[PDB]
């Protein structure tokens, strides 16, 4: 399209919502291509990531880790206003794995504290895609400080299986998985710092071990449990978008399955079916579609069980509805 | 199906066999859906995991690491009697990745020492699937103590390739791969412990490094070598089911290939073909189908070669038959320049 | 083919070229099956792998890390003369993952210093495949000393997409990724050794941590950056073959995509499409096809960004041509 053609397109302003929720959107595109407008303010803030009070200096798109899911349709333009307030200390930018050119946008969006920028790109490819900050010379440091999120570029006709049959979800959740590298003192106690820059050198030493101290969903151990457990009902179709900007993960819904899994995150690549545990490489997002068949509590995990149950990569679903004894029954309950 | 309908179904009692062998079964289903019955006693037992005598307090389904392969067909019910004998000290359960609800069965199978339970589930999806113990609060500790196996749910019509052609194996092996995290003393020597619980804290520390001290097939370094090497012949079609309940692996048949590989383990997901090295993420099983074309020794490995040859993740095949010089030949044998 | 038929096949000597470049070949096979002849001399030599003068006793097929890409077509034979000069101190061999029998050729090619050997195998399967040295009892040590490369076995009719439409590249690069495990003294300084064998015990200790000290392309930090960046033009179609003989990787073209990715490296397995980040497991090669749409500098990385930007796994592309504002534009440049 020409500059004139783009200028003539409808605009839509989106209000983003905090993960794991996703802003209001339509699965099938409503009308022709639009310029979809988003605004995010970057917040450098302390976050507490475990029950021992361990802190990370987060660098947070829209004030959350992960940043919010942005949803557009194929061949819409995503137009992001990105704001780096004067209250921040570092330069930041944004790279969309969905975008083409200038390192995914990072080359055009370098903003100091007190600056803003507006980037527009054409969402040419359908799928879920990581976005993350990547300042030249301090790339992994920003990413492992939680400066990453994802977008979803839906096909204009919504989702389909490998044979073109429509797949319509009732709910969608966005699980951003974060590897953190928290320095420890001589006694193995996690260190605290009073400025993000103060933590740099110590954090880089831990990073280079390639061994995260914490692996978490939505920025903290137990974040997506209890008050924040995801919910569904028997019969409900749920899409789970999962990203990891820096490190491999192996999602698994304990008690359920990934009925359709776009493991690569890309909708023009046919999904795998009947998945027990799928695999998302570091630097990518994937998506699983599941129809709940049993009520009860499910654990959604990274299925390295040390990472899930020692390092923090475990979320819950609470699912309402009627038990199905055909699928599963206790023929003899635990007994002498 | 109603309770009455399930009750009307035929029952078949299966006798399990120790890995890497698999109990007698039919590739194509014989008759309609059945309730296939299995029994396993859990054994907390000391095992030796290398030639040095390094010990693990294993938590073993049916007394083996891995637990045995249970084979059913799609829409059969798998009915497991699970027994935790009074001689054990821990509560245990079982989670079938194949199953739907109650955390895969875990929520319904928590048995203390001296207890049993019987779980039935409908095997709705065809493929190979991990099973493992997962007691709330102690999940990875049971799994990395060897308390895991796999099941195969064959399609009722047996295996096919991605394009409708029947695939029939002559033999099947189940390779369970296990990451062990054995504590070391100040000299770097592996520690031995009196009771399993004595090892807990030291073991969790190693686990947290995400660096196994041993990565093994069938419970020990070299377990599938020597007189325990797997066997085949030129022209023989072999299915190798491979599981890893906790940690990624990248299986490779050195000297061969994976002709058809269901890397995700799921038979409705078309297999990759002509594979050198395939990838099974932790918490999953995969399966590779290969027709041997050359005689001799093969090494079947996790192709992180450090994991294979330093940490223990290598098995052997001994293959009989005639050498094929078309496929490969030594034009000039090692000789002076 | 019968004995006489095999004997009657044309023999063709091919001159090799150092990575990331690839020797002369045709995408579509020229004529019927051939015995393609290659020669490689093994060089044991000290190489510097970083900006701090860190040394590795490299074990290098053809003097390079990775060894060079050999290109044949399906049902050709690859006939390699492998030479181990008497100036070397170790026995070596070669295993082709493409080959069938004798551990991939290793059983037939065990050459001491002052020995040569000639191995022929039929390239029965189309794809990119790892080759590496693997002396019994010293397999990972040779491999992580850089003694590995890849071959490409093109389909006789060249590459195709999932729909059988031809994919014809304008150029091809071969990126070999190497995990190194360099010992350090107790002050954290990388150690140096007089002979390769002197480093053996110390190196195996680092190897067993499963944590490389360096993860590099073309044998060294920054080998494929700056004046040695790979090149392309807007509209150019590029195939990027990527191998990792020992350890997982997750390639990503920063600013671009993998339009078609044979992530498993096997051409009979349909390519994934529209990929952000693909995954090649340790012990395999993969290949990505991309058509450049934007000019400028791209970074091509292993998207564990710690491995990329701390440990060395980052290359560049320098791409010429006209910027496409439809795909991406700075609506508002960074500003107060
Ligand atoms: Cu990126
Ligand atoms: Cu599990
Ligand atoms: Cu190999
Ligand atoms: Cu940033
Ligand atoms: Cu257990
Ligand atoms: Cu070698």
PDB file of N, CA and C in Angstrom, chain C residues 216-287:
ATOM      1  N   UNK C 216      29.909 -19.784  19.627  1.00  0.00           N
ATOM      2  CA  UNK C 216      30.393 -18.934  18.534  1.00  0.00           C
ATOM      3  C   UNK C 216      29.949 -19.427  17.164  1.00  0.00           C
ATOM      4  N   UNK C 217      29.974 -18.515  16.199  1.00  0.00           N
ATOM      5  CA  UNK C 217      29.747 -18.862  14.801  1.00  0.00           C
ATOM      6  C   UNK C 217      31.095 -18.774  14.066  1.00  0.00           C
ATOM      7  N   UNK C 218      31.348 -19.708  13.151  1.00  0.00           N
ATOM      8  CA  UNK C 218      32.570 -19.676  12.358  1.00  0.00           C
ATOM      9  C   UNK C 218      33.829 -19.591  13.226  1.00  0.00           C
ATOM     10  N   UNK C 219      33.787 -20.230  14.398  1.00  0.00           N
ATOM     11  CA  UNK C 219      34.996 -20.472  15.179  1.00  0.00           C
ATOM     12  C   UNK C 219      35.446 -19.397  16.168  1.00  0.00           C
ATOM     13  N   UNK C 220      34.751 -18.261  16.229  1.00  0.00           N
ATOM     14  CA  UNK C 220      35.217 -17.187  17.133  1.00  0.00           C
ATOM     15  C   UNK C 220      34.144 -16.136  17.372  1.00  0.00           C
ATOM     16  N   UNK C 221      34.203 -15.487  18.538  1.00  0.00           N
ATOM     17  CA  UNK C 221      33.324 -14.360  18.812  1.00  0.00           C
ATOM     18  C   UNK C 221      33.518 -13.330  17.685  1.00  0.00           C
ATOM     19  N   UNK C 222      32.405 -12.877  17.121  1.00  0.00           N
ATOM     20  CA  UNK C 222      32.405 -11.852  16.074  1.00  0.00           C
ATOM     21  C   UNK C 222      32.956 -12.221  14.708  1.00  0.00           C
ATOM     22  N   UNK C 223      33.188 -13.517  14.462  1.00  0.00           N
ATOM     23  CA  UNK C 223      33.699 -13.988  13.177  1.00  0.00           C
ATOM     24  C   UNK C 223      32.789 -13.580  12.016  1.00  0.00           C
ATOM     25  N   UNK C 224      31.484 -13.447  12.253  1.00  0.00           N
ATOM     26  CA  UNK C 224      30.582 -13.111  11.149  1.00  0.00           C
ATOM     27  C   UNK C 224      29.921 -11.736  11.335  1.00  0.00           C
ATOM     28  N   UNK C 225      30.696 -10.817  11.894  1.00  0.00           N
ATOM     29  CA  UNK C 225      30.217  -9.448  12.132  1.00  0.00           C
ATOM     30  C   UNK C 225      31.186  -8.438  11.519  1.00  0.00           C
ATOM     31  N   UNK C 226      30.769  -7.170  11.489  1.00  0.00           N
ATOM     32  CA  UNK C 226      31.603  -6.087  10.965  1.00  0.00           C
ATOM     33  C   UNK C 226      31.968  -6.266   9.518  1.00  0.00           C
ATOM     34  N   UNK C 227      33.268  -6.219   9.227  1.00  0.00           N
ATOM     35  CA  UNK C 227      33.762  -6.427   7.862  1.00  0.00           C
ATOM     36  C   UNK C 227      33.555  -7.864   7.356  1.00  0.00           C
ATOM     37  N   UNK C 228      33.189  -8.776   8.257  1.00  0.00           N
ATOM     38  CA  UNK C 228      32.909 -10.160   7.863  1.00  0.00           C
ATOM     39  C   UNK C 228      31.429 -10.492   7.998  1.00  0.00           C
ATOM     40  N   UNK C 229      30.585  -9.462   8.062  1.00  0.00           N
ATOM     41  CA  UNK C 229      29.141  -9.678   8.011  1.00  0.00           C
ATOM     42  C   UNK C 229      28.808 -10.368   6.695  1.00  0.00           C
ATOM     43  N   UNK C 230      27.781 -11.211   6.715  1.00  0.00           N
ATOM     44  CA  UNK C 230      27.219 -11.795   5.487  1.00  0.00           C
ATOM     45  C   UNK C 230      26.434 -10.708   4.752  1.00  0.00           C
ATOM     46  N   UNK C 231      26.198 -10.881   3.452  1.00  0.00           N
ATOM     47  CA  UNK C 231      25.544  -9.806   2.701  1.00  0.00           C
ATOM     48  C   UNK C 231      24.334 -10.286   1.929  1.00  0.00           C
ATOM     49  N   UNK C 232      23.454  -9.341   1.597  1.00  0.00           N
ATOM     50  CA  UNK C 232      22.334  -9.605   0.731  1.00  0.00           C
ATOM     51  C   UNK C 232      21.808  -8.279   0.217  1.00  0.00           C
ATOM     52  N   UNK C 233      20.852  -8.377  -0.695  1.00  0.00           N
ATOM     53  CA  UNK C 233      20.166  -7.209  -1.222  1.00  0.00           C
ATOM     54  C   UNK C 233      18.682  -7.430  -0.995  1.00  0.00           C
ATOM     55  N   UNK C 234      17.925  -6.345  -0.833  1.00  0.00           N
ATOM     56  CA  UNK C 234      16.462  -6.425  -0.885  1.00  0.00           C
ATOM     57  C   UNK C 234      16.031  -7.172  -2.156  1.00  0.00           C
ATOM     58  N   UNK C 235      15.137  -8.143  -1.976  1.00  0.00           N
ATOM     59  CA  UNK C 235      14.667  -9.012  -3.061  1.00  0.00           C
ATOM     60  C   UNK C 235      15.480 -10.284  -3.270  1.00  0.00           C
ATOM     61  N   UNK C 236      16.636 -10.373  -2.618  1.00  0.00           N
ATOM     62  CA  UNK C 236      17.474 -11.557  -2.724  1.00  0.00           C
ATOM     63  C   UNK C 236      16.955 -12.696  -1.856  1.00  0.00           C
ATOM     64  N   UNK C 237      17.045 -13.910  -2.385  1.00  0.00           N
ATOM     65  CA  UNK C 237      16.596 -15.094  -1.653  1.00  0.00           C
ATOM     66  C   UNK C 237      17.826 -15.799  -1.126  1.00  0.00           C
ATOM     67  N   UNK C 238      17.855 -16.004   0.190  1.00  0.00           N
ATOM     68  CA  UNK C 238      19.059 -16.530   0.861  1.00  0.00           C
ATOM     69  C   UNK C 238      18.713 -17.812   1.614  1.00  0.00           C
ATOM     70  N   UNK C 239      19.514 -18.858   1.408  1.00  0.00           N
ATOM     71  CA  UNK C 239      19.422 -20.060   2.268  1.00  0.00           C
ATOM     72  C   UNK C 239      20.506 -20.005   3.330  1.00  0.00           C
ATOM     73  N   UNK C 240      20.114 -20.176   4.591  1.00  0.00           N
ATOM     74  CA  UNK C 240      21.081 -20.153   5.696  1.00  0.00           C
ATOM     75  C   UNK C 240      21.066 -21.530   6.314  1.00  0.00           C
ATOM     76  N   UNK C 241      22.147 -22.268   6.096  1.00  0.00           N
ATOM     77  CA  UNK C 241      22.294 -23.605   6.690  1.00  0.00           C
ATOM     78  C   UNK C 241      22.971 -23.354   8.029  1.00  0.00           C
ATOM     79  N   UNK C 242      22.476 -24.006   9.072  1.00  0.00           N
ATOM     80  CA  UNK C 242      22.959 -23.818  10.415  1.00  0.00           C
ATOM     81  C   UNK C 242      23.164 -25.196  11.032  1.00  0.00           C
ATOM     82  N   UNK C 243      24.307 -25.431  11.664  1.00  0.00           N
ATOM     83  CA  UNK C 243      24.535 -26.733  12.315  1.00  0.00           C
ATOM     84  C   UNK C 243      25.010 -26.546  13.743  1.00  0.00           C
ATOM     85  N   UNK C 244      24.788 -27.574  14.566  1.00  0.00           N
ATOM     86  CA  UNK C 244      25.298 -27.610  15.911  1.00  0.00           C
ATOM     87  C   UNK C 244      25.457 -29.111  16.184  1.00  0.00           C
ATOM     88  N   UNK C 245      26.709 -29.564  16.218  1.00  0.00           N
ATOM     89  CA  UNK C 245      27.000 -31.005  16.349  1.00  0.00           C
ATOM     90  C   UNK C 245      26.821 -31.580  17.755  1.00  0.00           C
ATOM     91  N   UNK C 246      26.786 -30.717  18.770  1.00  0.00           N
ATOM     92  CA  UNK C 246      26.781 -31.160  20.162  1.00  0.00           C
ATOM     93  C   UNK C 246      25.651 -30.616  21.044  1.00  0.00           C
ATOM     94  N   UNK C 247      25.078 -29.473  20.684  1.00  0.00           N
ATOM     95  CA  UNK C 247      24.253 -28.742  21.633  1.00  0.00           C
ATOM     96  C   UNK C 247      23.149 -27.974  20.919  1.00  0.00           C
ATOM     97  N   UNK C 248      21.965 -27.914  21.520  1.00  0.00           N
ATOM     98  CA  UNK C 248      20.816 -27.186  20.961  1.00  0.00           C
ATOM     99  C   UNK C 248      21.126 -25.739  20.613  1.00  0.00           C
ATOM    100  N   UNK C 249      20.459 -25.256  19.573  1.00  0.00           N
ATOM    101  CA  UNK C 249      20.470 -23.838  19.265  1.00  0.00           C
ATOM    102  C   UNK C 249      19.097 -23.377  18.787  1.00  0.00           C
ATOM    103  N   UNK C 250      18.900 -22.056  18.739  1.00  0.00           N
ATOM    104  CA  UNK C 250      17.602 -21.508  18.341  1.00  0.00           C
ATOM    105  C   UNK C 250      17.819 -20.274  17.443  1.00  0.00           C
ATOM    106  N   UNK C 251      18.117 -20.522  16.154  1.00  0.00           N
ATOM    107  CA  UNK C 251      18.470 -19.376  15.309  1.00  0.00           C
ATOM    108  C   UNK C 251      17.328 -18.394  15.099  1.00  0.00           C
ATOM    109  N   UNK C 252      17.698 -17.122  14.987  1.00  0.00           N
ATOM    110  CA  UNK C 252      16.737 -16.070  14.723  1.00  0.00           C
ATOM    111  C   UNK C 252      17.399 -15.000  13.852  1.00  0.00           C
ATOM    112  N   UNK C 253      16.719 -14.604  12.769  1.00  0.00           N
ATOM    113  CA  UNK C 253      17.220 -13.492  11.971  1.00  0.00           C
ATOM    114  C   UNK C 253      16.528 -12.229  12.483  1.00  0.00           C
ATOM    115  N   UNK C 254      17.269 -11.425  13.251  1.00  0.00           N
ATOM    116  CA  UNK C 254      16.724 -10.210  13.890  1.00  0.00           C
ATOM    117  C   UNK C 254      16.479  -9.139  12.826  1.00  0.00           C
ATOM    118  N   UNK C 255      15.202  -8.832  12.606  1.00  0.00           N
ATOM    119  CA  UNK C 255      14.790  -7.897  11.555  1.00  0.00           C
ATOM    120  C   UNK C 255      14.145  -8.620  10.388  1.00  0.00           C
ATOM    121  N   UNK C 256      14.331  -9.937  10.346  1.00  0.00           N
ATOM    122  CA  UNK C 256      13.736 -10.780   9.321  1.00  0.00           C
ATOM    123  C   UNK C 256      12.974 -11.963   9.909  1.00  0.00           C
ATOM    124  N   UNK C 257      12.828 -12.998   9.094  1.00  0.00           N
ATOM    125  CA  UNK C 257      12.161 -14.234   9.500  1.00  0.00           C
ATOM    126  C   UNK C 257      12.817 -15.407   8.789  1.00  0.00           C
ATOM    127  N   UNK C 258      12.374 -16.613   9.136  1.00  0.00           N
ATOM    128  CA  UNK C 258      12.620 -17.783   8.295  1.00  0.00           C
ATOM    129  C   UNK C 258      11.339 -18.028   7.531  1.00  0.00           C
ATOM    130  N   UNK C 259      11.323 -17.644   6.250  1.00  0.00           N
ATOM    131  CA  UNK C 259      10.095 -17.777   5.457  1.00  0.00           C
ATOM    132  C   UNK C 259       9.717 -19.245   5.314  1.00  0.00           C
ATOM    133  N   UNK C 260      10.722 -20.073   5.025  1.00  0.00           N
ATOM    134  CA  UNK C 260      10.584 -21.520   5.038  1.00  0.00           C
ATOM    135  C   UNK C 260      11.726 -22.049   5.849  1.00  0.00           C
ATOM    136  N   UNK C 261      11.398 -22.872   6.839  1.00  0.00           N
ATOM    137  CA  UNK C 261      12.438 -23.436   7.690  1.00  0.00           C
ATOM    138  C   UNK C 261      12.306 -24.940   7.746  1.00  0.00           C
ATOM    139  N   UNK C 262      13.323 -25.648   7.263  1.00  0.00           N
ATOM    140  CA  UNK C 262      13.418 -27.089   7.500  1.00  0.00           C
ATOM    141  C   UNK C 262      14.133 -27.259   8.837  1.00  0.00           C
ATOM    142  N   UNK C 263      13.374 -27.120   9.928  1.00  0.00           N
ATOM    143  CA  UNK C 263      13.986 -27.059  11.269  1.00  0.00           C
ATOM    144  C   UNK C 263      14.747 -28.349  11.608  1.00  0.00           C
ATOM    145  N   UNK C 264      14.232 -29.484  11.128  1.00  0.00           N
ATOM    146  CA  UNK C 264      14.862 -30.803  11.310  1.00  0.00           C
ATOM    147  C   UNK C 264      16.002 -31.007  10.298  1.00  0.00           C
ATOM    148  N   UNK C 265      16.089 -30.102   9.320  1.00  0.00           N
ATOM    149  CA  UNK C 265      17.129 -30.147   8.284  1.00  0.00           C
ATOM    150  C   UNK C 265      16.803 -31.114   7.155  1.00  0.00           C
ATOM    151  N   UNK C 266      15.647 -31.760   7.216  1.00  0.00           N
ATOM    152  CA  UNK C 266      15.327 -32.813   6.250  1.00  0.00           C
ATOM    153  C   UNK C 266      14.268 -32.364   5.238  1.00  0.00           C
ATOM    154  N   UNK C 267      14.637 -32.406   3.951  1.00  0.00           N
ATOM    155  CA  UNK C 267      13.812 -31.759   2.905  1.00  0.00           C
ATOM    156  C   UNK C 267      12.513 -32.510   2.592  1.00  0.00           C
ATOM    157  N   UNK C 268      12.461 -33.791   2.941  1.00  0.00           N
ATOM    158  CA  UNK C 268      11.226 -34.562   2.796  1.00  0.00           C
ATOM    159  C   UNK C 268      10.214 -34.276   3.917  1.00  0.00           C
ATOM    160  N   UNK C 269      10.675 -33.613   4.978  1.00  0.00           N
ATOM    161  CA  UNK C 269       9.807 -33.144   6.047  1.00  0.00           C
ATOM    162  C   UNK C 269       9.414 -31.708   5.660  1.00  0.00           C
ATOM    163  N   UNK C 270       8.103 -31.442   5.494  1.00  0.00           N
ATOM    164  CA  UNK C 270       7.707 -30.114   4.992  1.00  0.00           C
ATOM    165  C   UNK C 270       8.248 -28.967   5.867  1.00  0.00           C
ATOM    166  N   UNK C 271       8.681 -27.854   5.239  1.00  0.00           N
ATOM    167  CA  UNK C 271       9.256 -26.748   6.012  1.00  0.00           C
ATOM    168  C   UNK C 271       8.217 -26.013   6.851  1.00  0.00           C
ATOM    169  N   UNK C 272       8.593 -25.587   8.060  1.00  0.00           N
ATOM    170  CA  UNK C 272       7.784 -24.633   8.806  1.00  0.00           C
ATOM    171  C   UNK C 272       7.837 -23.296   8.055  1.00  0.00           C
ATOM    172  N   UNK C 273       6.837 -22.443   8.268  1.00  0.00           N
ATOM    173  CA  UNK C 273       6.751 -21.153   7.558  1.00  0.00           C
ATOM    174  C   UNK C 273       6.589 -19.955   8.507  1.00  0.00           C
ATOM    175  N   UNK C 274       7.044 -18.784   8.063  1.00  0.00           N
ATOM    176  CA  UNK C 274       6.843 -17.524   8.787  1.00  0.00           C
ATOM    177  C   UNK C 274       7.498 -17.536  10.169  1.00  0.00           C
ATOM    178  N   UNK C 275       8.637 -18.232  10.288  1.00  0.00           N
ATOM    179  CA  UNK C 275       9.227 -18.502  11.589  1.00  0.00           C
ATOM    180  C   UNK C 275       9.925 -17.264  12.188  1.00  0.00           C
ATOM    181  N   UNK C 276       9.732 -17.031  13.483  1.00  0.00           N
ATOM    182  CA  UNK C 276      10.497 -16.002  14.190  1.00  0.00           C
ATOM    183  C   UNK C 276      11.844 -16.605  14.631  1.00  0.00           C
ATOM    184  N   UNK C 277      11.756 -17.761  15.290  1.00  0.00           N
ATOM    185  CA  UNK C 277      12.915 -18.409  15.888  1.00  0.00           C
ATOM    186  C   UNK C 277      12.671 -19.885  15.665  1.00  0.00           C
ATOM    187  N   UNK C 278      13.664 -20.582  15.128  1.00  0.00           N
ATOM    188  CA  UNK C 278      13.513 -22.020  14.927  1.00  0.00           C
ATOM    189  C   UNK C 278      14.462 -22.729  15.874  1.00  0.00           C
ATOM    190  N   UNK C 279      14.398 -24.055  15.903  1.00  0.00           N
ATOM    191  CA  UNK C 279      15.136 -24.837  16.890  1.00  0.00           C
ATOM    192  C   UNK C 279      15.824 -25.992  16.195  1.00  0.00           C
ATOM    193  N   UNK C 280      17.131 -26.092  16.416  1.00  0.00           N
ATOM    194  CA  UNK C 280      17.928 -27.174  15.862  1.00  0.00           C
ATOM    195  C   UNK C 280      18.516 -27.895  17.050  1.00  0.00           C
ATOM    196  N   UNK C 281      18.173 -29.190  17.232  1.00  0.00           N
ATOM    197  CA  UNK C 281      18.716 -29.867  18.406  1.00  0.00           C
ATOM    198  C   UNK C 281      20.189 -30.199  18.212  1.00  0.00           C
ATOM    199  N   UNK C 282      20.950 -30.247  19.305  1.00  0.00           N
ATOM    200  CA  UNK C 282      22.340 -30.702  19.264  1.00  0.00           C
ATOM    201  C   UNK C 282      22.489 -32.002  18.488  1.00  0.00           C
ATOM    202  N   UNK C 283      23.422 -32.014  17.539  1.00  0.00           N
ATOM    203  CA  UNK C 283      23.612 -33.149  16.659  1.00  0.00           C
ATOM    204  C   UNK C 283      22.837 -33.082  15.346  1.00  0.00           C
ATOM    205  N   UNK C 284      22.390 -31.897  14.946  1.00  0.00           N
ATOM    206  CA  UNK C 284      21.685 -31.768  13.677  1.00  0.00           C
ATOM    207  C   UNK C 284      22.035 -30.467  12.962  1.00  0.00           C
ATOM    208  N   UNK C 285      21.659 -30.412  11.696  1.00  0.00           N
ATOM    209  CA  UNK C 285      21.661 -29.159  10.949  1.00  0.00           C
ATOM    210  C   UNK C 285      20.227 -28.820  10.581  1.00  0.00           C
ATOM    211  N   UNK C 286      19.983 -27.534  10.321  1.00  0.00           N
ATOM    212  CA  UNK C 286      18.707 -27.043   9.833  1.00  0.00           C
ATOM    213  C   UNK C 286      18.992 -26.024   8.736  1.00  0.00           C
ATOM    214  N   UNK C 287      17.952 -25.614   8.028  1.00  0.00           N
ATOM    215  CA  UNK C 287      18.125 -24.645   6.936  1.00  0.00           C
ATOM    216  C   UNK C 287      16.925 -23.721   6.876  1.00  0.00           C
TER     217      UNK C 287
END
